[PDB]
Amino acid sequence: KVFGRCELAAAMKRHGLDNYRGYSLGNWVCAAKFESNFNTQATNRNTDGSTDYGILQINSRWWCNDGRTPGSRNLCNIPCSALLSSDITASVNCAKKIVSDGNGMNAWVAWRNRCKGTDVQAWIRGCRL
Ligand code: NA
């Protein structure tokens, strides 16, 4: 599923991401834009042989199982395929664990490089929330 910007903002807010570990909703929408372009089916191979899955490009190295990432963990206890669903519940539940891991949203290199310190509120502009 390719979410609308405001459509994704609403779904993330409903699932409790607005101000989760102090990160305003615009941060999460900005991260999703640059990670996936809001496409739940987005997959991208990393140089380390791990793969990133879904709207928030969650890594098979630590967070989900894809069965082809040697020496990897599955800390979200999910098949990586479950992070591609049109329902973002598994991605959001897993993102809450990632962002709580110690480095906050710096875990998303695209957030650090493209969203951090910017006017992230612009990403929820004109949305009925
Ligand atoms: Na894994």
DSSP label at 23?
B
Q: Rounded to the nearest whole angstrom, what is the distance from the C-alpha of residue 59 to the centroid of ligand 1?
A: 8
- Is 101 assigned to a binding site? yes
Q: Which residue numbers are catalytic?
A: 35, 52
Contact 93, 55 (CB under 8 A): no
Data resolution in angstroms: 1.6
Q: How was this structure determined?
A: X-ray
Distances (CA, A) of 126 to 6, 8, 25, 85, 115: 8, 13, 13, 26, 19
Rounded to 5°, the CA angle 77-11-66 comes to: 25
Q: Rounded to the nearest whole angstrom, what is the distance from the C-alpha of residue 39 to the centroid of ligand 1?
A: 21
DSSP label at 100?
T
Can you list the pairs that 40-44 forms with residues at least 24 positions away whose Cβ atoms lie under 8 Å?
Answer: 40/1, 40/2, 40/3, 40/84, 40/85, 40/86, 40/88, 40/91, 41/1, 41/84, 43/84
Q: Rounded to the nearest whole angstrom, what is the distance from the C-alpha of residue 61 to the centroid of ligand 1?
A: 5
Give the residue numbers spanning the domain of 122: 1-129
Residue 10's domain is classified under what CATH number?
Answer: 1.10.530.10
Can you list the pairs that 104-112 forms with residues at least 24 positions away whose Cβ atoms lie under 8 Å?
Answer: 104/21, 104/22, 104/23, 105/23, 105/27, 105/31, 108/31, 108/35, 108/56, 108/57, 110/31, 110/34, 110/35, 110/57, 111/27, 111/30, 111/31, 111/34, 111/35
Distances (CA, A) of 52 to 32, 67, 80, 117: 12, 13, 9, 24
Tell me the HSE value of 95 on the side-chain side, using a 13 A CA sphere: 29
- Where on the phi/psi map is residue 64: left (φ > 0), alpha (ψ -120 to 50), or beta? beta
Contact 84, 41 (CB under 8 A): yes
Q: Rounded to the nearest whole angstrom, what is the distance from the C-alpha of residue 56 to the centroid of ligand 1?
A: 16
Q: Looking at the 3D structure of the chain, how many domains does it have?
A: 1
